[PDB]
Tab-separated table of C-alpha atoms in Angstrom:
chain	number	residue	atom	x	y	z
A	1	UNK	CA	4.602	-42.750	-10.745
A	2	UNK	CA	5.627	-39.784	-8.966
A	3	UNK	CA	7.131	-36.814	-10.870
A	4	UNK	CA	8.147	-33.980	-8.449
A	5	UNK	CA	6.439	-32.032	-5.736
A	6	UNK	CA	5.615	-28.101	-6.360
A	7	UNK	CA	6.684	-25.980	-3.392
A	8	UNK	CA	4.717	-22.594	-2.781
A	9	UNK	CA	5.841	-20.486	0.126
A	10	UNK	CA	2.478	-18.771	0.643
A	11	UNK	CA	1.962	-15.271	2.388
A	12	UNK	CA	-1.461	-14.561	3.904
A	13	UNK	CA	-2.078	-10.839	5.135
A	14	UNK	CA	-4.989	-9.923	6.990
A	15	UNK	CA	-6.906	-7.174	5.580
A	16	UNK	CA	-9.908	-7.189	7.829
A	17	UNK	CA	-9.926	-8.432	11.517
A	18	UNK	CA	-9.719	-12.454	11.179
A	19	UNK	CA	-11.474	-14.528	13.629
A	20	UNK	CA	-10.784	-18.474	13.654
A	21	UNK	CA	-11.991	-19.633	16.758
A	22	UNK	CA	-9.949	-21.875	18.969
A	23	UNK	CA	-16.086	-14.071	24.830
A	24	UNK	CA	-14.388	-15.898	21.957
A	25	UNK	CA	-10.551	-16.092	21.605
A	26	UNK	CA	-8.750	-17.031	18.488
A	27	UNK	CA	-6.815	-20.153	17.860
A	28	UNK	CA	-3.177	-19.690	19.334
A	29	UNK	CA	-0.122	-21.792	19.626
A	30	UNK	CA	3.335	-21.098	21.480
A	31	UNK	CA	5.961	-19.071	19.824
A	32	UNK	CA	9.334	-18.058	20.675
A	33	UNK	CA	9.435	-14.514	20.520
A	34	UNK	CA	12.847	-12.638	19.493
A	35	UNK	CA	14.179	-16.414	20.269
A	36	UNK	CA	13.850	-15.674	24.071
A	37	UNK	CA	10.321	-15.256	25.393
A	38	UNK	CA	7.429	-18.020	25.047
A	39	UNK	CA	4.316	-16.477	23.669
A	40	UNK	CA	0.830	-17.859	22.688
A	41	UNK	CA	0.150	-16.243	19.402
A	42	UNK	CA	-2.392	-16.663	16.391
A	43	UNK	CA	-1.678	-19.050	13.421
A	44	UNK	CA	-3.968	-19.992	10.823
A	45	UNK	CA	-4.786	-23.659	10.448
A	46	UNK	CA	-4.194	-25.240	7.014
A	47	UNK	CA	-7.887	-26.950	7.497
A	48	UNK	CA	-9.428	-23.334	7.362
A	49	UNK	CA	-7.841	-22.439	4.186
A	50	UNK	CA	-8.249	-25.601	2.374
A	51	UNK	CA	-11.740	-26.138	3.558
A	52	UNK	CA	-12.668	-22.760	2.687
A	53	UNK	CA	-11.092	-22.852	-0.660
A	54	UNK	CA	-12.690	-26.277	-1.337
A	55	UNK	CA	-15.945	-24.957	-0.413
A	56	UNK	CA	-15.788	-22.066	-2.576
A	57	UNK	CA	-14.875	-24.218	-5.645
A	58	UNK	CA	-17.818	-26.711	-4.696
A	59	UNK	CA	-19.911	-23.502	-4.655
A	60	UNK	CA	-19.047	-22.290	-8.014
A	61	UNK	CA	-19.308	-26.010	-9.441
A	62	UNK	CA	-15.623	-25.835	-10.687
A	63	UNK	CA	-14.723	-28.619	-13.099
A	64	UNK	CA	-11.649	-29.428	-14.778
A	65	UNK	CA	-10.567	-28.618	-18.365
A	66	UNK	CA	-13.203	-31.450	-19.347
A	67	UNK	CA	-15.969	-32.521	-16.675
A	68	UNK	CA	-13.660	-34.085	-14.737
A	69	UNK	CA	-13.652	-33.686	-10.755
A	70	UNK	CA	-10.190	-32.123	-10.188
A	71	UNK	CA	-11.438	-30.351	-6.999
A	72	UNK	CA	-11.933	-34.077	-5.665
A	73	UNK	CA	-8.681	-35.341	-6.988
A	74	UNK	CA	-6.808	-32.346	-5.677
A	75	UNK	CA	-8.385	-31.785	-2.273
A	76	UNK	CA	-9.339	-35.598	-1.636
A	77	UNK	CA	-12.376	-37.819	-2.037
A	78	UNK	CA	-3.166	-40.705	-2.861
A	79	UNK	CA	-2.383	-37.163	-1.672
A	80	UNK	CA	-2.071	-34.381	-4.209
A	81	UNK	CA	-2.292	-31.165	-2.261
A	82	UNK	CA	-1.072	-30.228	1.351
A	83	UNK	CA	-1.793	-26.609	2.755
A	84	UNK	CA	0.215	-26.642	6.115
A	85	UNK	CA	-0.554	-24.421	9.273
A	86	UNK	CA	0.725	-20.625	8.528
A	87	UNK	CA	2.418	-19.025	11.374
A	88	UNK	CA	3.260	-15.331	12.204
A	89	UNK	CA	5.943	-13.559	9.845
A	90	UNK	CA	7.581	-12.651	13.320
A	91	UNK	CA	9.578	-9.668	11.410
A	92	UNK	CA	8.518	-6.797	13.673
A	93	UNK	CA	7.564	-8.754	16.702
A	94	UNK	CA	10.430	-8.337	19.136
A	95	UNK	CA	8.715	-8.692	22.525
A	96	UNK	CA	5.804	-10.532	24.071
A	97	UNK	CA	4.097	-7.164	24.333
A	98	UNK	CA	4.654	-6.360	20.655
A	99	UNK	CA	3.119	-9.771	20.150
A	100	UNK	CA	-0.299	-9.644	21.016
A	101	UNK	CA	-0.780	-6.299	19.839
A	102	UNK	CA	-1.563	-8.571	16.775
A	103	UNK	CA	-4.873	-9.301	18.735
A	104	UNK	CA	-7.752	-6.791	18.742
A	105	UNK	CA	-10.998	-7.107	21.153
A	106	UNK	CA	-13.849	-6.458	19.313
A	107	UNK	CA	-17.385	-6.058	20.827
A	108	UNK	CA	-20.430	-7.258	19.204
A	109	UNK	CA	-22.174	-7.264	23.707
A	110	UNK	CA	-19.785	-10.263	23.315
A	111	UNK	CA	-16.059	-9.633	23.052
A	112	UNK	CA	-14.459	-11.173	19.960
A	113	UNK	CA	-10.884	-11.627	19.345
A	114	UNK	CA	-9.484	-10.944	15.927
A	115	UNK	CA	-6.111	-11.015	14.684
A	116	UNK	CA	-5.457	-7.157	13.261
A	117	UNK	CA	-5.201	-5.903	9.929
A	118	UNK	CA	-1.588	-6.061	8.491
A	119	UNK	CA	-0.476	-9.117	10.197
A	120	UNK	CA	1.055	-11.493	8.053
A	121	UNK	CA	1.418	-15.447	7.851
A	122	UNK	CA	4.038	-17.792	6.258
A	123	UNK	CA	3.066	-20.974	5.326
A	124	UNK	CA	3.891	-23.796	2.612
A	125	UNK	CA	1.819	-25.528	-0.007
A	126	UNK	CA	3.041	-28.814	-1.508
A	127	UNK	CA	1.436	-29.959	-4.888
A	128	UNK	CA	2.540	-33.464	-5.766
A	129	UNK	CA	2.538	-34.190	-9.385
A	130	UNK	CA	2.512	-37.773	-10.989
A	131	UNK	CA	2.766	-39.064	-14.497
A	132	UNK	CA	-0.588	-38.283	-16.260
A	133	UNK	CA	-1.591	-35.525	-14.320
A	134	UNK	CA	-2.496	-32.256	-15.829
A	135	UNK	CA	-0.145	-29.906	-14.115
A	136	UNK	CA	-1.492	-26.521	-15.388
A	137	UNK	CA	-4.938	-27.371	-14.717
A	138	UNK	CA	-4.338	-28.373	-11.126
A	139	UNK	CA	-2.468	-25.138	-10.462
A	140	UNK	CA	-5.301	-23.157	-12.118
A	141	UNK	CA	-7.782	-24.796	-9.809
A	142	UNK	CA	-5.739	-23.694	-6.973
A	143	UNK	CA	-5.219	-20.285	-8.269
A	144	UNK	CA	-9.006	-19.425	-8.912
A	145	UNK	CA	-9.678	-21.111	-5.650
A	146	UNK	CA	-7.479	-18.317	-3.917
A	147	UNK	CA	-9.203	-15.492	-6.237
A	148	UNK	CA	-12.742	-16.771	-4.901
A	149	UNK	CA	-11.423	-16.525	-1.391
A	150	UNK	CA	-10.172	-13.049	-1.812
A	151	UNK	CA	-13.754	-11.967	-2.630
A	152	UNK	CA	-14.711	-13.945	0.629
A	153	UNK	CA	-13.329	-14.544	3.865
A	154	UNK	CA	-11.637	-16.748	6.350
A	155	UNK	CA	-12.860	-17.777	9.831
A	156	UNK	CA	-16.162	-16.892	11.089
A	157	UNK	CA	-18.365	-13.692	11.102
A	158	UNK	CA	-17.478	-12.786	7.649
A	159	UNK	CA	-21.101	-11.097	7.218
A	160	UNK	CA	-19.811	-9.020	9.964
A	161	UNK	CA	-16.805	-8.083	7.751
A	162	UNK	CA	-14.353	-9.913	9.370
A	163	UNK	CA	-11.485	-12.298	7.826
A	164	UNK	CA	-10.872	-10.690	4.481
A	165	UNK	CA	-7.258	-11.843	3.469
A	166	UNK	CA	-4.765	-11.392	0.583
A	167	UNK	CA	-3.015	-14.493	-0.505
A	168	UNK	CA	0.370	-14.381	-1.996
A	169	UNK	CA	2.054	-17.552	-3.549
A	170	UNK	CA	5.644	-17.099	-4.441
A	171	UNK	CA	7.123	-18.467	-7.430
A	172	UNK	CA	6.943	-22.151	-7.659
A	173	UNK	CA	9.800	-24.358	-6.812
A	174	UNK	CA	10.020	-27.676	-8.375
A	175	UNK	CA	11.443	-30.510	-6.678
A	176	UNK	CA	12.488	-33.885	-8.432
A	177	UNK	CA	14.017	-37.010	-6.905
A	178	UNK	CA	17.598	-35.149	-7.590
A	179	UNK	CA	16.476	-32.073	-5.260
A	180	UNK	CA	16.112	-34.525	-2.340
A	181	UNK	CA	19.533	-35.681	-2.482
B	1	UNK	CA	-26.339	-22.386	-7.671
B	2	UNK	CA	-24.290	-19.235	-7.852
B	3	UNK	CA	-24.045	-17.028	-10.815
B	4	UNK	CA	-21.684	-14.071	-10.188
B	5	UNK	CA	-20.659	-11.456	-7.758
B	6	UNK	CA	-21.114	-7.917	-7.739
B	7	UNK	CA	-18.512	-5.940	-6.071
B	8	UNK	CA	-18.766	-2.037	-4.963
B	9	UNK	CA	-15.797	0.033	-4.265
B	10	UNK	CA	-17.196	1.815	-1.489
B	11	UNK	CA	-16.359	5.361	0.123
B	12	UNK	CA	-17.680	6.857	3.394
B	13	UNK	CA	-16.837	10.740	3.746
B	14	UNK	CA	-17.618	11.953	7.276
B	15	UNK	CA	-19.670	15.115	7.380
B	16	UNK	CA	-20.014	15.608	11.096
B	17	UNK	CA	-17.989	14.236	13.815
B	18	UNK	CA	-18.256	10.487	13.787
B	19	UNK	CA	-17.576	8.601	17.068
B	20	UNK	CA	-17.639	4.593	16.880
B	21	UNK	CA	-16.550	3.439	20.402
B	22	UNK	CA	-14.119	0.997	21.163
B	23	UNK	CA	-12.640	10.387	28.105
B	24	UNK	CA	-14.095	7.744	25.381
B	25	UNK	CA	-11.936	6.960	22.237
B	26	UNK	CA	-13.079	5.725	18.728
B	27	UNK	CA	-12.200	2.629	17.854
B	28	UNK	CA	-8.936	2.192	15.902
B	29	UNK	CA	-6.274	-0.036	14.454
B	30	UNK	CA	-2.623	0.043	13.346
B	31	UNK	CA	-1.809	1.866	10.179
B	32	UNK	CA	1.603	2.520	8.645
B	33	UNK	CA	2.538	6.342	8.075
B	34	UNK	CA	4.900	6.787	5.078
B	35	UNK	CA	4.930	2.876	5.328
B	36	UNK	CA	7.654	3.382	8.140
B	37	UNK	CA	6.186	4.454	11.432
B	38	UNK	CA	3.243	2.836	13.236
B	39	UNK	CA	0.144	4.744	14.492
B	40	UNK	CA	-3.220	3.854	15.825
B	41	UNK	CA	-5.986	5.589	13.460
B	42	UNK	CA	-9.465	5.132	13.088
B	43	UNK	CA	-11.583	2.837	10.778
B	44	UNK	CA	-15.291	2.053	10.388
B	45	UNK	CA	-16.270	-1.341	11.071
B	46	UNK	CA	-18.435	-3.258	8.445
B	47	UNK	CA	-20.730	-4.350	11.071
B	48	UNK	CA	-21.583	-0.757	12.095
B	49	UNK	CA	-22.580	0.184	8.508
B	50	UNK	CA	-24.586	-3.193	7.867
B	51	UNK	CA	-26.074	-2.748	11.441
B	52	UNK	CA	-27.233	0.792	10.962
B	53	UNK	CA	-28.250	0.124	7.359
B	54	UNK	CA	-30.514	-2.806	8.326
B	55	UNK	CA	-31.799	-1.353	11.556
B	56	UNK	CA	-32.838	1.583	9.348
B	57	UNK	CA	-34.728	-0.711	6.819
B	58	UNK	CA	-36.365	-2.338	9.609
B	59	UNK	CA	-38.104	0.680	11.097
B	60	UNK	CA	-39.136	1.575	7.649
B	61	UNK	CA	-40.811	-1.964	7.389
B	62	UNK	CA	-38.967	-2.445	4.046
B	63	UNK	CA	-40.266	-5.251	1.807
B	64	UNK	CA	-39.643	-6.475	-1.738
B	65	UNK	CA	-41.822	-6.261	-4.767
B	66	UNK	CA	-44.231	-8.876	-2.976
B	67	UNK	CA	-44.153	-9.454	0.752
B	68	UNK	CA	-40.353	-10.338	0.240
B	69	UNK	CA	-38.318	-9.954	3.507
B	70	UNK	CA	-35.427	-9.175	1.098
B	71	UNK	CA	-33.606	-7.626	4.163
B	72	UNK	CA	-33.398	-11.300	5.684
B	73	UNK	CA	-32.484	-12.549	2.168
B	74	UNK	CA	-29.723	-10.071	2.365
B	75	UNK	CA	-28.589	-9.202	5.501
B	76	UNK	CA	-29.065	-12.400	6.838
B	77	UNK	CA	-32.035	-14.138	9.204
B	78	UNK	CA	-25.881	-18.559	2.339
B	79	UNK	CA	-24.064	-15.381	2.494
B	80	UNK	CA	-25.121	-12.546	0.032
B	81	UNK	CA	-24.082	-9.161	1.437
B	82	UNK	CA	-20.548	-8.690	2.817
B	83	UNK	CA	-19.788	-4.932	4.129
B	84	UNK	CA	-16.076	-5.122	4.965
B	85	UNK	CA	-14.331	-2.817	7.147
B	86	UNK	CA	-13.279	0.561	5.821
B	87	UNK	CA	-10.080	2.157	6.144
B	88	UNK	CA	-8.362	5.793	6.142
B	89	UNK	CA	-8.152	6.870	2.974
B	90	UNK	CA	-4.283	6.762	2.161
B	91	UNK	CA	-4.224	10.396	1.768
B	92	UNK	CA	-4.573	10.968	5.673
B	93	UNK	CA	-1.121	8.970	6.483
B	94	UNK	CA	1.413	10.253	4.018
B	95	UNK	CA	2.608	12.083	7.241
B	96	UNK	CA	2.232	12.312	10.923
B	97	UNK	CA	1.019	15.964	9.840
B	98	UNK	CA	-2.394	14.383	8.720
B	99	UNK	CA	-2.927	11.276	11.518
B	100	UNK	CA	-3.542	14.322	14.432
B	101	UNK	CA	-5.986	16.079	12.558
B	102	UNK	CA	-8.051	13.089	11.774
B	103	UNK	CA	-9.531	12.902	15.672
B	104	UNK	CA	-11.082	15.608	17.156
B	105	UNK	CA	-11.754	15.636	21.028
B	106	UNK	CA	-15.026	17.067	21.653
B	107	UNK	CA	-16.204	18.171	25.187
B	108	UNK	CA	-19.959	17.150	26.252
B	109	UNK	CA	-16.302	14.469	29.263
B	110	UNK	CA	-14.118	14.547	26.134
B	111	UNK	CA	-15.195	12.320	23.236
B	112	UNK	CA	-13.126	11.514	20.574
B	113	UNK	CA	-14.549	11.950	17.002
B	114	UNK	CA	-13.520	11.348	13.276
B	115	UNK	CA	-13.180	14.950	11.815
B	116	UNK	CA	-15.643	16.032	9.034
B	117	UNK	CA	-13.753	15.562	5.683
B	118	UNK	CA	-11.822	12.190	6.310
B	119	UNK	CA	-12.566	9.490	4.160
B	120	UNK	CA	-12.794	5.805	4.315
B	121	UNK	CA	-12.881	3.020	1.742
B	122	UNK	CA	-13.960	-0.485	1.742
B	123	UNK	CA	-15.758	-3.201	-0.499
B	124	UNK	CA	-19.255	-4.227	-0.599
B	125	UNK	CA	-19.670	-7.724	-2.178
B	126	UNK	CA	-22.990	-9.017	-3.267
B	127	UNK	CA	-23.381	-12.787	-4.253
B	128	UNK	CA	-26.199	-13.438	-6.944
B	129	UNK	CA	-27.760	-16.724	-6.859
B	130	UNK	CA	-30.422	-18.506	-9.087
B	131	UNK	CA	-33.656	-17.368	-8.526
B	132	UNK	CA	-32.503	-14.333	-6.092
B	133	UNK	CA	-33.902	-10.703	-7.488
B	134	UNK	CA	-30.825	-8.754	-8.238
B	135	UNK	CA	-32.708	-5.693	-9.060
B	136	UNK	CA	-34.404	-5.755	-5.882
B	137	UNK	CA	-31.302	-6.527	-3.799
B	138	UNK	CA	-29.311	-3.534	-5.012
B	139	UNK	CA	-32.478	-1.419	-4.783
B	140	UNK	CA	-32.818	-2.705	-0.831
B	141	UNK	CA	-29.144	-2.044	-0.423
B	142	UNK	CA	-29.230	1.689	-2.049
B	143	UNK	CA	-32.468	2.475	0.019
B	144	UNK	CA	-30.697	1.638	3.081
B	145	UNK	CA	-27.780	3.469	2.284
B	146	UNK	CA	-30.123	6.317	1.234
B	147	UNK	CA	-31.949	6.224	4.684
B	148	UNK	CA	-28.546	6.386	6.406
B	149	UNK	CA	-27.524	9.639	4.930
B	150	UNK	CA	-30.434	11.146	6.885
B	151	UNK	CA	-29.455	9.382	10.089
B	152	UNK	CA	-25.992	8.976	11.413
B	153	UNK	CA	-23.354	6.465	12.156
B	154	UNK	CA	-22.290	5.661	15.489
B	155	UNK	CA	-23.185	7.376	18.915
B	156	UNK	CA	-24.452	10.809	20.007
B	157	UNK	CA	-26.543	11.253	16.705
B	158	UNK	CA	-28.857	13.283	18.479
B	159	UNK	CA	-26.273	15.755	19.244
B	160	UNK	CA	-25.509	15.901	15.585
B	161	UNK	CA	-22.542	13.301	15.622
B	162	UNK	CA	-21.994	10.653	12.842
B	163	UNK	CA	-23.416	12.711	9.561
B	164	UNK	CA	-22.067	10.130	6.880
B	165	UNK	CA	-22.019	10.467	2.736
B	166	UNK	CA	-21.642	6.876	1.267
B	167	UNK	CA	-20.722	6.844	-2.474
B	168	UNK	CA	-21.015	3.511	-4.191
B	169	UNK	CA	-18.698	2.958	-7.240
B	170	UNK	CA	-19.991	1.559	-10.469
B	171	UNK	CA	-20.795	-2.280	-10.136
B	172	UNK	CA	-18.267	-4.754	-11.202
B	173	UNK	CA	-19.935	-7.939	-12.023
B	174	UNK	CA	-17.680	-10.886	-11.473
B	175	UNK	CA	-18.741	-14.465	-12.865
B	176	UNK	CA	-16.460	-17.569	-12.945
B	177	UNK	CA	-14.749	-15.864	-15.803
B	178	UNK	CA	-12.945	-12.783	-13.787
B	179	UNK	CA	-11.786	-15.437	-11.134
B	180	UNK	CA	-10.077	-17.502	-13.794
């Protein structure tokens, strides 16, 4: 039986140049910049965050308060955790030329695209809570997974120093059946 | 099996004009001056430091206590050593007063180079697994850093460019405890 969803308005700040692949470009999608101009701009796929956090917890052998596989129960072997695609906070992005200033071309002698340090992504995380679930343990498993990621990296070329990320969850919003009406 | 991570707060001080390429400009990224105004200012890519340190270790034929290719086990052939990009100390970005002095235009052709005395900071993350030689790993990293100080970062090292002083903080050990 379902209790409520916990909603997190997550923010992802790029600390070192971030490369999530699609010369190798980063994955992009169409934005309407300044509510006028169509522009292809980076986004962070939810699969990248969820897959990276999951692999990090499996590397540290994260188990629940007992021996339970909370990692499997949350991230999947009924859905308990969605991490959606995150899109650019277009807060200081007012023209298509301001847009892909966001992207740096970095040589390594191929040329790799990266999302420059300081760009911010906004995305939702939805946690579904059912009766019999340990909400505090699930949040904790999510939090320390985020902690693991910040001492690691998103995307590729992390050995080269790419993809250091600061993840900020807001305060949790609990929505029960009442709030959906 | 993972045991812990070792975090070093790293500092890099330019001793002689450092040129890491992108008239020949140095690689730059967007900074914020006073956290208001944008400006393109230099940074040191982590690949420059890691690549030069490994390159130096190899010209020396560095090995572990046995025939260990510890350079490969660390710098790669699982991740064990991350060297992140290094960005300007927040002292150089309190005003436009300081951003202009950071870059010197030196004739040789005009070559940009980061002025002597500017400081960068970044992180070195080491991951230690079951059966890895932590003492030799740290020794191999520190030996490469030591060799770097008698070499150079970037280009035109023969002309005296890119002398660098690297300072590692005290190591921060982080097991599962510090991540919960």
